[PDB]
């Protein structure tokens, strides 16, 4: 895999889009 959770920027586009709370994405769900 390549979650790209990181390079999701140089690959998809922007990363800080979720600001950073993304960490909660797979935690508070």
Ligand X SMILES: *C(=O)CC[C@H](NC(=O)CC[C@H](NC(=O)CCCCCCCCCCCCCCC)C(=O)O)C(=O)O
In the complex, the residues that contact ligand X under the rule CB under 6 A are 3-6, 8, 12-13, 15, 17, 26
Nearest approach in angstroms of CB 19 to ligand X is: 12
Alpha carbon distances (Å) from 11 to 5, 6, 19, 25: 10, 9, 17, 20
**Residues 28, 22 contacting (CB under 8 angstroms):** no
Nearest approach in angstroms of CB 21 to ligand X is: 12
Nearest approach in angstroms of CB 29 to ligand X is: 11
Nearer Cβ to ligand X (19/26): 26
């Amino acid at each position: 895999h390549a979650q790209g959770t990181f390079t999701s920027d140089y690959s998809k586009k922007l990363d800080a889009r979720r600001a950073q709370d993304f960490v909660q994405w797979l935690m508070n769900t």
